[PDB]
Amino acid sequence: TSWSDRLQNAADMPANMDKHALKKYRREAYHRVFVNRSLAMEKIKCFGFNMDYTLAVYKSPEYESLGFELTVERLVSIGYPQELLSFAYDSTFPTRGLVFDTLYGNLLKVDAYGNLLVCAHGFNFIRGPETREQYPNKFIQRDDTERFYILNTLFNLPETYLLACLVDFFTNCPRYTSCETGFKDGDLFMSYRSMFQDVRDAVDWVHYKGSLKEKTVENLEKYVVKDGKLPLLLSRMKEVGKVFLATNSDYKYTDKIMTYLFDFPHGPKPGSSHRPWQSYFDLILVDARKPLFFGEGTVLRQVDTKTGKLKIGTYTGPLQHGIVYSGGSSDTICDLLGAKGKDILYIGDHIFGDILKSKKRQGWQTFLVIPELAQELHVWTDKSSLFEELQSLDIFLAELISSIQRRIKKVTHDMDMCYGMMGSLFRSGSRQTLFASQVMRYADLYAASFINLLYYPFSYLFRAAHVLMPHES
Amino acid sequence: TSWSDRLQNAADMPANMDKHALKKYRREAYHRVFVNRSLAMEKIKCFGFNMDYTLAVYKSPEYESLGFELTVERLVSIGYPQELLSFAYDSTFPTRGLVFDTLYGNLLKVDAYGNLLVCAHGFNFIRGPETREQYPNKFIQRDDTERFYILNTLFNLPETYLLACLVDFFTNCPRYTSCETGFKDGDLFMSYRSMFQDVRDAVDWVHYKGSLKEKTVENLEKYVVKDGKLPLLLSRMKEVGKVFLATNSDYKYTDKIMTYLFDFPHGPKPGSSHRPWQSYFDLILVDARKPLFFGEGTVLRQVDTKTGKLKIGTYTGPLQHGIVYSGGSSDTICDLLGAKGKDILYIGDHIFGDILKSKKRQGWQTFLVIPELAQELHVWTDKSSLFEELQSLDIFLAELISSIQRRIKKVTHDMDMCYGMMGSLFRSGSRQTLFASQVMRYADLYAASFINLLYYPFSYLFRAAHVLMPHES
Amino acid sequence: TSWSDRLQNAADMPANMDKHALKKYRREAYHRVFVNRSLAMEKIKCFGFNMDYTLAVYKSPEYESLGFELTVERLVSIGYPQELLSFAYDSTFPTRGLVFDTLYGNLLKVDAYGNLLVCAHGFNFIRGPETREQYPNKFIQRDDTERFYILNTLFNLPETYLLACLVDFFTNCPRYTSCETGFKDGDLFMSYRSMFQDVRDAVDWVHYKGSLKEKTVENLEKYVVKDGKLPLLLSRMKEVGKVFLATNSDYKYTDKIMTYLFDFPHGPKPGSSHRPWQSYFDLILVDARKPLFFGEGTVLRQVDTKTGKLKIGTYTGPLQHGIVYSGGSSDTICDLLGAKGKDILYIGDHIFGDILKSKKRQGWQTFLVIPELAQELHVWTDKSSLFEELQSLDIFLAELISSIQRRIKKVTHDMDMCYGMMGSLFRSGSRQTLFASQVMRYADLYAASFINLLYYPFSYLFRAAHVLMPHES
Amino acid sequence: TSWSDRLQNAADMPANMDKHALKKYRREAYHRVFVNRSLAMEKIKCFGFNMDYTLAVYKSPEYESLGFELTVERLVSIGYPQELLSFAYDSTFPTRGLVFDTLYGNLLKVDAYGNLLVCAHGFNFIRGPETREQYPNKFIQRDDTERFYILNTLFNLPETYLLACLVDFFTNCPRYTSCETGFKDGDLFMSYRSMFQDVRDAVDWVHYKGSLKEKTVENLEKYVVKDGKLPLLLSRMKEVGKVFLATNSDYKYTDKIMTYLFDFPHGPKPGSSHRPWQSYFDLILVDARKPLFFGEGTVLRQVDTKTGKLKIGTYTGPLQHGIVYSGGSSDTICDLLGAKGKDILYIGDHIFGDILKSKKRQGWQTFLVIPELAQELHVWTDKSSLFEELQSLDIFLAELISSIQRRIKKVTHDMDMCYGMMGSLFRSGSRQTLFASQVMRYADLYAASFINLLYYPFSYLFRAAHVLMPHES
Numbered sequence A, B, C, D: 001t002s003w004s005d006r007l008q009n010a011a012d013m014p015a016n017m018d019k020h021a022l023k024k025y026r027r028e029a030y031h032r033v034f035v036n037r038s039l040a041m042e043k044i045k046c047f048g049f050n051m052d053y054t055l056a057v058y059k060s061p062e063y064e065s066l067g068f069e070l071t072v073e074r075l076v077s078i079g080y081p082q083e084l085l086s087f088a089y090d091s092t093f094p095t096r097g098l099v100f101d102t103l104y105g106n107l108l109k110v111d112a113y114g115n116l117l118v119c120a121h122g123f124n125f126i127r128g129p130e131t132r133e134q135y136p137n138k139f140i141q142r143d144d145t146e147r148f149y150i151l152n153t154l155f156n157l158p159e160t161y162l163l164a165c166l167v168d169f170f171t172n173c174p175r176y177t178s179c180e181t182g183f184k185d186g187d188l189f190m191s192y193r194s195m196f197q198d199v200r201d202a203v204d205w206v207h208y209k210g211s212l213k214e215k216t217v218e219n220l221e222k223y224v225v226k227d228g229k230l231p232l233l234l235s236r237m238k239e240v241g242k243v244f245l246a247t248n249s250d251y252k253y254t255d256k257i258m259t260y261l262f263d264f265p266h267g268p269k270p271g272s273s274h275r276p277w278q279s280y281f282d283l284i285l286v287d288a289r290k291p292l293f294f295g296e297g298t299v300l301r302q303v304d305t306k307t308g309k310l311k312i313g314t315y316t317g318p319l320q321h322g323i324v325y326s327g328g329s330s331d332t333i334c335d336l337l338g339a340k341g342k343d344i345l346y347i348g349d350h351i352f353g354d355i356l357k358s359k360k361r362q363g364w365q366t367f368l369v370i371p372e373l374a375q376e377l378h379v380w381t382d383k384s385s386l387f388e389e390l391q392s393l394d395i396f397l398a399e400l401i402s403s404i405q406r407r408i409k410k411v412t413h414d415m416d417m418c419y420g421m422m423g424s425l426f427r428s429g430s431r432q433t434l435f436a437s438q439v440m441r442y443a444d445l446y447a448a449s450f451i452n453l454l455y456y457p458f459s460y461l462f463r464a465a466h467v468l469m470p471h472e473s
């Protein structure tokens, strides 16, 4: 049971719009909206969305496994050895948000301060003492972007596993010599850094020039969660505010995906006329180039929706019914929809490119969709006894012996393994990950799906407890 | 009663080193060390310090008022009108950490997300509705460093008030015409931005080329808190670890100040031989150029302590007794003292240049000295009934009317005014400031003075409660 | 009769290697090597080449016209109007080295100091007085690369004409409104700058992703000058020095072109065994990325010549027989061939990327191939009476009336038109072009073809008169 | 007899303004204006000047020797060894335009292509073979400004000699160890690069914060050439055009110097009322910050000429009688004087910051003052037999033996030594220097003094022969 299985099971349910059924529904953890900062929904004037993994939720592990296969094939096509063809995607290995160290070829899980929580070289998990040879302070400077790449997106899940596969393969293949910073094959040296860049390039190529989009749209049922409640919630949002889409995807792909997402024999509610997906949006913008979109952006273009090509020149007209935009910036949205920053709730899945940047650069309010949470929640509640025991050991150790330090590592390992080989997205044991820290700081609201907003009344006030400084308590 | 009065009153006390007297002492709020993240003191191997407002705490308002006078005089000497001479420093106006908007000539107090909490044009406090003309979203992008300057240091306190004085003077002087972005005097236009830069330049000039250091060292009793407990605590720290100084100041000034701070007729404890201030440090480094110091730094030089001039060339030797360093980088410290990042507790007062940068770039542990807290604490505890009422109004309003919104602003104003015209350093009403947010995120420990570490035993474990995500609760 | 017709007529001649026949041959202007700085051939140790328009000389106008057609088609395929399909390449319009002003949509011919010599808007030639509206000083700052693009290469000849075609078409098409900086089509504005970038992009696309290389190699006789004397001269050069190729092209294309250039039923001389083109080179380097190649370059890779793909990793071995390199830098050449800068004669056609950069950055000696010179020479000598008259008018006017100024413009126009609508590559009237100035300053030797070196003995000393300063005369 | 002696001897002459006396005067080489590109004086509308070494010509070697002494003293004051005090300026050593190589501590004289002509380490002149260890190609990349500094100005003459002195002193002082890249003194390493920067800093300090200007203005007769013909020529220029000053100096210094230059008991001609120096200029601009001045410049300020301080704010008014400007850009001049680029003759001494930049960035016409030419001309004409013999040997060697190569070096050395140890400013033997090349390319006119324009009638046409390409001859 993957996280997309949870979402697709909740998706197959019809909406019961009785008030009491909703309030009782939204108290169960899986359909809940979680709150980092209070947010008065009645002050929201525009609801905004990206598409990938928000409106269009890609099924797991099928879609990661497709991306992995096509990326492997691209690497082999450019000259990587045939043995790559024998890899097979394994969803139990990668957790999202790991850091790849291009100097030493390691996947790292770190906390908000760059402290190492997990270190794997290939599939070899390096215990604390042995990491100190390469990380004397058990610490990395994350902002050294020449060395470290943070695998922040669900799209990064195939390459997270692929990088470990590659390191494992070359380490154990007798034609190569392992070195501190890469592999030597006689008179060719492949550094982990250049190997890493080939992987990034091949992922980019699969998405832009390869066949991933084509293979997706030819079996959308296999690859995309479909939920009749999506047009219901969008319709309700449009009753109390304006609705816009700002996606990095092109129009042709967006049009195929969105058409599939709205393809029911009815409109918002069963028994109503079907309406095209564009009618649910006051503003549609593609080729957004986020996060640049939240700074100066690019020139505003107009899509010729008949042909799928951009018209020639910069678009200087007003907002019109049926016009589709390309590029521009977040000021385009605010100007054309007459909204100020905090009037906008932006719903996205990119912790950096959607949430952090719209919050910091524009003062937008934010809803982070976290797909894996639909399954992380289930592990969390089923194994609460593990975590409660860890909390209890932490408190006992503090009151103090070394027998307890070993019990702490044992429980920590046993808890993490329930999530995968790389542990929970949000923590390793009692130590929070960087990703968890970013969620709390930049996502005002978050949830496994934004559909969970359907179970809250129109002017609900999401509430979070105020923060007090230690000396204020 | 200023904050330096509180510190100087606690400084005049001799240390009673009975255990029970200490533990009872450190529970009173004013001598307490406050904890954002747990810190096991027994794992600390090096204690590091800056000098200004940490070891050498400048008395308030005397020292701000001196800096203000010399800066005013510098501006008049370069051609600013004589009326500036009639300004007089007023410590009730500035709170530290305000943002000066060079486009519109405003001082702003903002929260961690750039939301406006207070806006003053000169001494005119702009109420919410009127700020929306210049700030349509009640929001600023703080990282736009061309437009916004964050007055983060206590050294910035004179110019915080001076900028408001200048805006007030030119607005109300009939020889000038007020414009959106500055003042017009016939054929000369003075933008708030260029006016602002003249102020920054004049402050820099007073510190580097003017007479501020000279006037300080000629009346150190007037200008510098002196505490016999300082060499006691340094001596105790050196018993369980290494001790270093890394200051941006030059050697000559450091030597005059530090000599004054250690000028008692005794050493660490009364009755012991006096020892020179240098003997309390395993490594002394001046001209540190923080925050660049925590990146690549500058070349390591050696001070000729007899003449106060740098020797010629780059120093390539080892750590020696009596050598004083200049420049270098934080790696110099770690190499010469054989310490790793988390082995170091760095004690400073610059939330950015000392704490944030040493934490993010090097993984150092941090102690932030906040001088004003010695008085903010007293206001906080004396007027807790105001804040408790505000908390109660917040909770009541949430359960819901507009009569309560006005009561909320009334109590908020009345609470803020107890701290000054710009309110508490840490909040305005129930809304936390950017500065408070930075303290919680980057200062592992903080206190009005680092002397408060004297009241904790050698291997004390400072404890902070673990963070849980909303969905983990 | 185009310039490639002249070269192909001289190419069909067999080489007569009698000494007296050579010396008499090389004195005729068309087979001459022209000398800007003296060069002792006996001190040359390596001869180096690029490929395009040096070894592989593309026939004119056929090859420009192919590039024009494919570029037009690419623009139409992305949404430019169908009328573009009715353009047809016209070799009488463009001269190489014109500057396109992206602000005002003009082609400019300028001297070495940026003075305007010719200005055309579309096909409208702007006379002196009318240019002063947009160019008040009849001057452009060429180094303002955001505004001005210098159409330096023969590959730029199709787009030089295309840009004028486009400006002409949009100016005169009633669906558009002409503006100072571009064209308005209701709510779309196409600036000359963005129009210009679409053209650059489409040329790049034709070369890299389009079908230009494919169409070339499927009719090489139509598109490429073929000369049996090429392997003869290369063989002779290899007898007294080392020979290398450094081309920006990829291996697959280089291999097809070079194979065609050496496809005779014999080797260097008739009656000798044919040898593969690679055996004529001590070092073969592709994907050179000049001019970056003459600075830090890119990583050195090794071509798998069987598959045409780069091997995986950085190549760290030595020079081997049969190895083909990719990327690297000019230091690769000098290291692997044991040559110093002035030991190398580099033979290229890019006045900037081959000649200027290798001369300025590395001290290489230079031979600039100028294909058009094979025809410019013929015009020059046939119409010498026009130029001699202009010289005579210049001297007469100086001794002095306005009747002569008009005669000067008349003769200037009549002389320029013999070369094309944009005049001689080297001058307009008595005023030298920027391109001529760059040739004299950076090309030690130059010629219509490098084959002309065949007619000079092994250790010939090319001689140029010494320069004296005005006060030295 | 220095070059300033020649100028001061010609300065003491009264002007005889009979036409025939002038024409006969201007044909003698020393009072001649030399012409690189033809220039019709009647088309000139504005004459512009810098001050230092153009209007105010500093006497030699007195003024270099003062700058040397003050720079030495500054280095000793910051900790350089006392032995520096025993240096004494020696005008026979430096020639202007040498390149200091901060990697290897050498002064280099190079041609226009970076070929080495002379190499001195300290006072040790390195013969050709021995230079190839550090310069394998006898070549430097001049644009590598991190490594090479081009000592282009007469102000650079003191430090040119000082750098050689320093290298000589440290090489031969037993307290130091010579290394490839600097000097080691136990645990201090002084690289030639950091030594070089200390020298640059100390020169800058002497000019801006030291006592050079003060010592100059207290003995102007000793330090500044004074010529009654200067106000005569300025007055004549103002009769046919506009006159402006654009100097990097501040107003106070400019005012002292210019007042001295115009301090005669008469105005333009003897017997006329004296007029203040400002009345000879339509526009006076100080603090010009050339060469930035010819790009975007700095903000336009207004000088308070009573106090010598800048007024407060940006000046936005028009050109007024008596206003003195500060900063701005070259567009300020062109706007306020209504002149286009080629309408301006700019008279300066900085081959880069005055001539090259005004020519390339703005299309100004240029007059380069070269003070040393007043003496280089005398050496040139007195030793023409040496150069004519060298020319004859060059031609003979070309027709060919090694006995002549040695005679060529002998004559080359003997000719160069007549100019100084670093040879002629314009050449070494028959090889032209970089500086000569820049003069020919960027200075339309040049002369030992601009006063030489006095001997040419109002609308003289300076003439230079047209350039022909080798294939055009």
Ligand SMILES: O=c1[nH]cnc2c1ncn2[C@@H]1O[C@H](COP(=O)(O)O)[C@@H](O)[C@H]1O
Residues within 6 Å of the ligand: A050, A051, A052, A053, A153, A155, A156, A203, A204, A205, A207, A208, A246, A247, A248, A249, A250, A253
């Ligand atoms: O790793 C990447 N390389 C290239 N394209 C990506 C990558 N990750 C996501 N995308 C694209 O991003 C688009 C979704 O953007 P969104 O709707 O703004 O979230 C899809 O077109 C993806 O193909």
Ligand SMILES: O=c1[nH]cnc2c1ncn2[C@@H]1O[C@H](COP(=O)(O)O)[C@@H](O)[C@H]1O
Residues within 6 Å of the ligand: B050, B051, B052, B053, B153, B155, B156, B203, B204, B205, B207, B208, B246, B247, B248, B249, B250, B253
């Ligand atoms: O605003 C400023 N301009 C110039 N110098 C400053 C400023 N603020 C602090 N300083 C200097 O910083 C030094 C203290 O550095 P610390 O001991 O590292 O905290 C003193 O020499 C101050 O004069």
Ligand SMILES: O=c1[nH]cnc2c1ncn2[C@@H]1O[C@H](COP(=O)(O)O)[C@@H](O)[C@H]1O
Residues within 6 Å of the ligand: C050, C051, C052, C053, C153, C155, C156, C203, C204, C205, C207, C208, C246, C247, C248, C249, C250, C253
């Ligand atoms: O305008 C251009 N855009 C893209 N490729 C170009 C352009 N001009 C020349 N090339 C390529 O440059 C190569 C020839 O490089 P060369 O042999 O170093 O002179 C060929 O592969 C051309 O396709």
Ligand SMILES: O=c1[nH]cnc2c1ncn2[C@@H]1O[C@H](COP(=O)(O)O)[C@@H](O)[C@H]1O
Residues within 6 Å of the ligand: D050, D051, D052, D053, D153, D155, D156, D203, D204, D205, D207, D208, D246, D247, D248, D249, D250, D253
């Ligand atoms: O090496 C230098 N360092 C600092 N100032 C210089 C240097 N060289 C020239 N100057 C200054 O340049 C000014 C003359 O500028 P000019 O009149 O524009 O040529 C004088 O004030 C000099 O002191």
